[PDB]
Amino acid sequence: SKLVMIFASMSGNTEEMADHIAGVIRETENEIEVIDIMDSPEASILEQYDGIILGAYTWGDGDLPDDFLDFYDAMDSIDLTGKKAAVFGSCDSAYPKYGVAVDILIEKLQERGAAVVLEGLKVELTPEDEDVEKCLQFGAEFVKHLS
Ligand SMILES: Cc1cc2nc3c(=O)[nH]c(=O)nc-3n(C[C@H](O)[C@H](O)[C@H](O)COP(=O)(O)O)c2cc1C
Ligand SMILES: OC[C@H]1O[C@H](O)[C@H](O)[C@@H](O)[C@@H]1O
């Protein structure tokens, strides 16, 4: 199957997670295109993939990264019925609205008809060894839902 991952990372923590998850998926008989939100992908591309993984840190007052805002708006016009999806991100418990960008992106995927097949994966700041193993389990469990 053909998969897409779109991630946002300012300081590198969510990108570390993205690279682990994608590297695990690449050891299966599936292809994945990993795209940084800074490179301005259009949301319509999500319609062309069998599975979708989004990654995002949380910013400001429990908001999406600034660079995700246009893409998020454009998601109101796409049809994701049938697709398998999941979301991850790095987080900081110095903030009350912890990792809520993950929850916001999950909600939007649900609204557009995607089957969200995993709980959101939240890691505190830079992954430690146990967090890295959680990234491996996320990728392995995601693939199981593909046909
Ligand atoms: C201005 C600012 C606001 C933030 N607001 C939140 C927040 O509401 N909730 C949260 O979990 N983290 C918040 N964070 C923490 C980042 O999401 C966290 O540092 C994360 O590791 C960044 O991921 P990245 O390395 O991929 O950029 C905020 C960080 C900054 C700098
Ligand atoms: O493409 C836009 C439309 O897509 C779907 O029909 C949504 O359910 C609807 O809320 C939205 O207006």
Domain parsing of the chain, residue ranges: 1-147
Residue whose token pair is 């995601």: 142
Alpha-carbon torsion 110, 135, 102, 53, what sign? negative
In this structure, the residues whose C-beta lies within 6 A of any atom of ligand 1 are 9-15, 57-60, 62, 90-92, 95, 97-99, 125
Among 84, 85, 93, 83, residue whose Cα is nearest residue 122: 93
> Measuring from atom 9 of ligand 1, which residue has the nearest CA?
98
Among 25, 95, 94, residue whose Cα is nearest residue 55: 25
* C-alpha 43 – ligand 2 centre gap (Å): 14
* C-alpha 77 – ligand 2 centre gap (Å): 6
Q: Does the domain at residues 1-147 carry the CATH identifier 1.20.1300.10? A: no
Alpha carbon 21 to its chain centroid, in Å, reads 10
